[PDB]
Design a protein around this ligand. Structure first.
Ligand code: NA
Ligand code: NA
Ligand code: NA
Ligand code: NA
Ligand code: NA
Ligand code: NA
Lengths: 989, 989
């Protein structure tokens, strides 16, 4: 019979296993003096729902365009109202049947008219730095070719096709193609021509490609320099000039520069250079550095380095995969400002302009090829393109374009084959190709744990325990003795760790101590730098971030795309403030007697001469003493004890007992740097003189009794419930025990440890911890002092359908001014439910007050939140914030905002002030309840109800990283137990 | 110190382990000529939230009532806006810490003024037939006592307290008490004075209690009669008269009536009798029957009986636990009309008036004590009141009041100790007490499988397989040899089986065949008779039923209270129509040659003389022949072959081949009965002459091709998709394969069989069956006949992120009038997901039509729905219903309304008619999509969208009873497989 379906030819091309056709050889991205014209700007665009209905109406000519409208290019076109973004993590959004594509496949036709002056003849090309996922390119109706590899560059010769004057460039882009099966990164699906489009003249006697080789001999101090230059794939005559080093040499010859200052992330020394032929000159920035593996350590310039890293996706909350240059520069500065020294380009090459900025600002870069096949894992990796010989040419092409583009940049210290792509013959082919092309950079790939085709051993989210075993070289052996010996000689990197989703990440300090202890450990890269929030404006014009499912997706992964150290607009999350402290490159340990501090220089290359060392003593009234102390430069990996002026110690000795005072020593930048202004804080340490325990008020005030109320000084109690209804005139609507919090993203994750396959959030719901009930057992007034009395209220807390509970006793006392509150908690019954021991989130009290709080002040840790396994960046001091600024604007609202280690607190309720003191407690204050917080999926769902929710916790659980990787470490868990704690309360005007 | 809490005395009483205080001895409910006054009517009512704030303001006197309002009594007070109903199944709504009660405990103060004439002096009492859960009673300010046992009667002597003329009765009712721990039935929590309140004069020389003993000697035909009569607990002189039997005897003497007609559910013969003393006469209805266990069979009057039973809760959708008498009478008639002969009073004694109606209409009754402690199971039965000696007196009191009230009623054939109360010493004490008081009725209790203290072996939801083993006496042995021998000599009853929640129950026929095969099997009681829906009126005034969670409950069990054979207003569900057929008491097997039918009388006592046997032959045009055939009475458990008139067989022989005709033989009531009018259908059987296969149209019409459309006779196809866009001018918006349906309540239940602990609904979601995607592979026109052509469209169906699929090929053909459609389905890949084989709900097609359907007609099974393991009550015939009447109004919308076994169908779309024919298919038609159906939680969420959703299924899965008990039996499951089926389509005006 006769074939009748439509669009079969277009679909066959989209199903191609091969790389793009018609492109020039892959090469470096080079700054050249050749004439160039950027075609970025306002293009014309038409969208069709699939190949079979994509018109074949000659639109490529620009004449009588039917159905086109203006669209910026570069762009991710769903960010501009054409379709919508869609988020999946691992799962494909289409049926898995490679190489076939779904019928619903957005086809975007792009068209731009431009003018080519005489400087673009006789030879020129068109460059495309990124098209997701399949491009077909026509110029003046003539097909140039196709693009595969969404984040890779393609160039097409236009000689004999480009015309003098007006030209018409047409590009048909398909969202889905066979290449989608190898681009399954955990991120938004966003088609478009999302990077630069450039016309570049190719003058005769020019330079097509350049390969910089700039090594460093750390013994002699020599630089080893060879700059290759080619045209049409052939080495050519060219002259290399490096003026700062008094150098003129031929391209292609290796020389020995007697002395060079070596490049590192800490000291990113770059030498300006130019390589030029008769027709073209290329400008280079040369950093001399050598990379080697020896004694199972990753070494640069002869030294083991510590990677303080993040995984960087490219995302912008309004432009999608288009990241404006100013945002790139700003976020790299922000990384440096938080002590980061390393970046993994998860999981594809970045915009080409990123490389020079990393060279300049100083980051160790893991440059990763555009390859991920994670969605094949759930079928046992059946049909995985990574092990399918039909995909070999396509995957080698991806690696070749990755390597060729960025090979000249000192910041790149490892090539990565891809991410979560299983094991297979094509990964081996990619590795062999890279090792042969560029032996100067070790190869990284986590997906094959046997590490057969790599030079470093990489894992993601390995526990602190397994990392310690690896650090000692005693992890279990591979079955193959030869492969085991190879891997045991490799250094070890965590390419992803301490998953930073929501409240968290907990457990960072335990990893860092191992990094410092064991040379084989290279460090780690946090997952991830940024949340992929997409800005949404609601009915009222109130902006907030959207995540998976908020754009009508049929299958999605929710807020797992919002898992970053900064939000999509680069505002730090608390996790980044903690991370900065965890990875600080200097350690400052202040002596308890305030005579001095131990200073350890944790850097690998630089001394301490860039830093100014400042001290300040702060007390309740303010600063009492402070200044700068001169420190002879301390070498990398060396230590010294720095004396503080005698006045500081003398001040500590004269302090009256119980008066709190904090000595803080900081290392700040002595001068402006390329990434921060002078005075920027890099490291700090403290010694605290703690306030004395608040003496409980003498119980000299008696209990006065009325039919329905009891009064004890400034406290009024309901006689029916035994609970206070007001304290100093502040209405108390509720007081009770808490054991639960609104689950974090981590609490919604499964702990793949133990026989319990429920997330902690589910364990808590099953146990009833979110719906506690209180029974009153009795109320008694007991003799106090000089006619005074204490009031003891006995209660039992439990939950419907449960037999376990806790006996909670409140003992109240007052001298008329201060109120004393002792709370005693005693376990009743066995706290087991559905066969497993119940764990608590906290041991604390919730005060619900009938008035709003405008201001929260405290002495403790701050300014930001802290939980048992977080809060490293929260330092001791006196803090005060408006109520709203106590919250944390996580995209999915969740437990957050607790200030652990508080010794005193003050809430301003309009005109009066409520003061809380006692042994250390955690402090949280909110204008809405925990049930409202738990129910809210986006921040607009949070609405104040005119009350104050005050949380005073005697104990808290950690937050961990159970959303992906380890849960809460054993020492931070909270099993049911007896407890007792004392508070004082005071209300003033 | 000094005690200061409030209300401690009230709470201490509520925590009492003891029975109520102050009541007269428990006795029978008796029809007496003693003067009586019902105090039912409009009372005054005040509600307090708990004991500690319940006023002690002297309200018991009726003077200056502060805060009282009118309330009907009897009532469940949350049904009248005081609080709200709350539904839990097993879980308690309060902390489990017996005997303690929560602080939130509705306290209802009831008050009524009444007048007592001289006939109520000097002696009278007040009777309360039910108070949930704790009552305290005052008369004229004087405390009478308290009530415990919510569904049990209490009487208080008011001699010397009742006054001539005006009196004031005050009752304080607490919702929760220690007794709540032993009243954990799966039902709504509903406090109130919910049964009659009566003043009764007690004249001197009267009769307090009566115990009827009326046995039957099945050998001699004698009745064995002894009527005991007592006053103040002492046997008294009284005369018993039974006029119909020519009897006058003294109370307390056993006599032998020479001949009596025995009582059974089938023939509920009752003799009017009176026992009288000088001061009082009591009217009785005496049914002579004897109960015995012999040869491991439960026998009445010397015959093993088959229980065709339901579990009857007391519920009314607007009045709660108050069931108006007219509703009781109507629903018992409805039970008889659906062949039911047995009732279990789950799980408490019914209203006292129920007993006489069961005597009269004829049901075997399992009368169950008010005891259930199910909520202790989840803590390993720790603290279970059933094994706590401190609860012995309270639990024996419950059993004593249960037995004493109803002991005179022939319909009661077993006493049940309670339900789901574990095992324990107090259950044994209850059994010992009952066996001693009334040896004439065997004891039932399912909670102790060892059956130590019972006379029958009872289970709930035992599988058909285990029931077959029990029926053969080869179930596994108990560890105790003595207890094993006892239990193996017991008959076996399913006190609850074939859970009737939502679409279902499936698997009824397999149980019934075992009941018929094995004498040891007594039968079973369906769970349950009625859905406990509560009527709710929404914003627009649209009524619907609410279930758990719809009334603000903190903990609840959702729609598990809507699990009945009839809805709360007693409208039959399809399950009741199927059940009636399953348990029909006669079997009618029509010969294939239409010469006669085999008639088996499945009754235990009655012959067939109450029935008229009618036949009718029906064809497309209408009835062709019919009449009545005289049948000599067939004895119980006997069989005969009844000849039909020769004209019927002659008609079958003359039928042209392929013409459909149905011979139906019915057994209807020959005369009015007490429960249905003459002509009521009891049993039926059929023989069908099936229509010949529709010959496919000759493919003489060719495919005409256009740029974007293909036309083949009356079918227009999209050339882009290959699917029809119209058939005979009827718009087709979508056509595709189906494998999924909107989960039933059963599909949301876990199959505790196999290693997969996901409900089927979850298995389907995980597998993507609800989100199928279709890829087009090709379209071809092939040579047909005489220039005609067929059109074959090749597709593959799968789901996002899955590698398995099905190849689906559509072959279209037409002669211009009729359209032929062949569908071929071929498995592609292994249909396994998350480690388990995927199961399908169906193999079918969904047509989405762009116009509404007003009427659906078909030849097949009807009128109601049928699935592979249901539809017994759906008979063969021609049916036609408005679209809305094809649906089933389940409270939670779910898959329903399929008509299996359809051979032809006709949809009326405005003016035109769409006809479907072919080999048997299942037919479903809806005005909304499956996704709308699945998302809808209540019926108002269903909204028509102006389309027609037509489902034609080649195969369906069964529905089972997985919500509670067995899932779908193996033979009704649907594993992925290849399939092929043919349809013809025709559109007319
Ligand atoms: Na991934
Ligand atoms: Na993520
Ligand atoms: Na939330
Ligand atoms: Na139960
Ligand atoms: Na139920
Ligand atoms: Na539904």
């Amino acid at each position: 019979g006769r074939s009748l379906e439509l669009g079969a030819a277009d679909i066959q091309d989209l199903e191609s296993f091969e790389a793009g056709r018609g492109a020039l050889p892959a090469r470096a991205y080079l700054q050249s003096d050749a004439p160039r014209l950027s075609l970025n700007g306002e293009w014309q665009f038409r969208l069709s729902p699939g190949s079979r209905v994509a018109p074949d109406d000659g639109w490529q000519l620009g004449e009588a365009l039917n159905g086109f409208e203006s669209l910026p290019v570069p762009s991710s076109w769903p960010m501009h109202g054409h379709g919508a973004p869609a988020y999946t993590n691992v799962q494909f959004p289409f049926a898995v049947e490679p190489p076939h594509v779904p019928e619903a496949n957005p086809i975007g036709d792009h068209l731009v008219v431009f003018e080519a002056g005489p400087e673009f003849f006789p030879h020129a090309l068109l460059r495309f730095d990124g098209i997701e996922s399949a491009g077909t390119v026509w110029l003046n109706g003539v097909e140039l070719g196709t693009t595969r590899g969404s984040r890779l560059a393609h160039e097409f010769d236009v000689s004999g096709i480009l015309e003098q004057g007006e030209n018409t460039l047409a590009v048909r882009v398909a969202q889905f193609s066979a290449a989608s099966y190898v681009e399954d990164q955990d991120m938004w699906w966003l088609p478009g021509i999302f990077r630069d489009v450039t016309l570049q003249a190719r003058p005769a006697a020019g330079i097509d490609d350049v390969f910089v080789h700039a090594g460093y001999d750390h013994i002699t101090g020599e630089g080893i320099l060879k700059v290759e230059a080619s045209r049409g794939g052939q080495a050519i005559d060219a002259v290399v000039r490096v003026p700062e080093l008094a150098l003129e040499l031929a391209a292609g010859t290796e020389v020995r520069v007697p002395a060079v200052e070596p490049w590192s992330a800490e000291v990113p020394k770059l030498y300006e250079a130019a390589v030029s032929a008769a027709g073209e000159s290329v400008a280079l920035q040369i950093g001399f550095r050598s990379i080697a593996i020896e004694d199972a350590q990753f070494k640069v310039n002869g030294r083991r380095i510590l990677l303080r890293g993040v995984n960087r996706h490219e995302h912008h909350p309004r432009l999608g995969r288009v990241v404006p240059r100013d945002v790139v520069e700003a976020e790299l500065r922000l990384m440096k400002q938080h002590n980061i020294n390393a970046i993994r380009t998860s999981h594809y090459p970045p915009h080409p302009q990123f490389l020079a900025l990393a060279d300049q600002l100083g980051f160790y870069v893991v440059l990763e090829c555009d390859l991920e096949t994670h969605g094949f894992e759930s079928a046992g990796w059946a049909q995985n393109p990574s092990d399918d010989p039909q995909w070999e040419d396509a995957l080698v092409d991806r690696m070749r374009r990755t390597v060729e583009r960025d090979k000249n940049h000192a910041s790149v210290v490892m090539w990565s084959l891809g991410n979560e792509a299983g094991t297979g013959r094509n990964l081996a082919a990619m590795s062999r190709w890279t090792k042969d092309r560029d032996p100067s950079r070790p190869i990284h790939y986590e997906g094959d744990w046997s590490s057969e085709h790599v030079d470093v051993y990489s894992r993601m989210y390995a526990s602190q325990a397994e990392t310690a075993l690896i650090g000692q070289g005693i992890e279990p052996a591979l079955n193959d003795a030869a492969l085991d010996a190879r891997r045991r000689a490799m250094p070890f990197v965590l390419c992803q760790y301490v998953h930073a989703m929501g409240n968290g990440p907990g457990g960072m300090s335990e990893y860092q101590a191992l990094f410092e202890k064991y040379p084989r450990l290279m460090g780690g890269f946090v997952w991830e730098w940024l949340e992929h929030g997409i800005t949404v404006s609601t009915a009222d014009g109130v902006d907030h971030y959207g995540y998976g499912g908020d754009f009508g997706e049929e299958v999605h992964d929710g807020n797992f795309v919002t898992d970053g150290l900064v939000d999509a607009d680069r505002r730090p999350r608390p996790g980044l403030l903690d991370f900065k402290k965890v990875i600080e490159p200097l350690r400052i340990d202040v002596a308890r007697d305030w005579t001095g501090f131990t200073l350890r220089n944790g850097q690998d290359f630089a001394d301490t001469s860039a830093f100014s060392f400042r001290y300040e003593v702060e007390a309740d009234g303010g600063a009492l003493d402070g200044g700068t102390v001169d420190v002879a430069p301390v070498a990398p990996q060396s230590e010294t004890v720095v004396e503080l002026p005698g006045s500081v110690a003398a001040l500590a000795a004269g302090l009256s007992d119980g008066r709190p005072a904090v000595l803080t020593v900081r290392a700040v930048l002595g001068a402006d740097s390329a990434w921060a202004d002078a005075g920027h804080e890099v490291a700090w340490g403290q010694s605290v003189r703690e306030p004395g325990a608040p003496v409980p008020p003498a119980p000299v005030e008696p209990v006065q009794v009325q039919d329905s109320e009891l009064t004890l000084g400034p406290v009024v109690f309901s006689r029916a419930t035994g609970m206070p209804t007001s304290i100093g005139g502040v209405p108390v609507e509720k007081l009770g025990l808490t054991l639960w919090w609104a689950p974090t993203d981590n609490d919604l994750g499964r702990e793949w440890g133990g026989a319990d396959e429920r997330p902690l959030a589910t364990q808590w719901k099953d146990a009833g911890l979110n719906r506690l009930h209180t029974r009153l057992l009795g109320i008694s007034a007991n003799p106090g002092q000089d006619g005074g009395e204490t009031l003891t209220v006995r209660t039992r807390v439990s939950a419907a359908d449960k037999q376990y509970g806790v006996l909670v006793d409140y003992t109240w006392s007052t001298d008329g001014e201060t109120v004393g509150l002792r709370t005693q908690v005693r376990r009743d019954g066995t706290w087991v439910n559905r066969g497993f021991e119940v764990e608590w989130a906290r041991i604390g009290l919730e005060f619900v007050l009938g008035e709003e709080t405008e201001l929260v002040s405290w002495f403790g840790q701050g300014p930001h939140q802290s939980y048992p396994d977080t809060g490293q960046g929260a330092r001791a001091g006196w803090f005060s914030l408006p109520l709203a600024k106590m919250d944390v604007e996580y995209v999915r609202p969740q437990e957050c905002g607790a200030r652990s280690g508080s010794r005193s607190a003050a809430l301003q309720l309009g005109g009066r002030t409520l003061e809380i003191c006692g042994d250390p407690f955690a402090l949280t204050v909110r204008p809405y309840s925990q049930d409202v917080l738990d129910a809210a999926a986006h921040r607009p769902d949070l609405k104040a109800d005119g009350r104050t929710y005050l949380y005073v916790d005697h104990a808290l659980r950690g937050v961990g990283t159970a959303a992906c990787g380890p849960g809460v470490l054993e020492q931070y868990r909270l099993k049911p137990r007896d407890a007792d704690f004392i508070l004082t309360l005071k209300v003033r005007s």
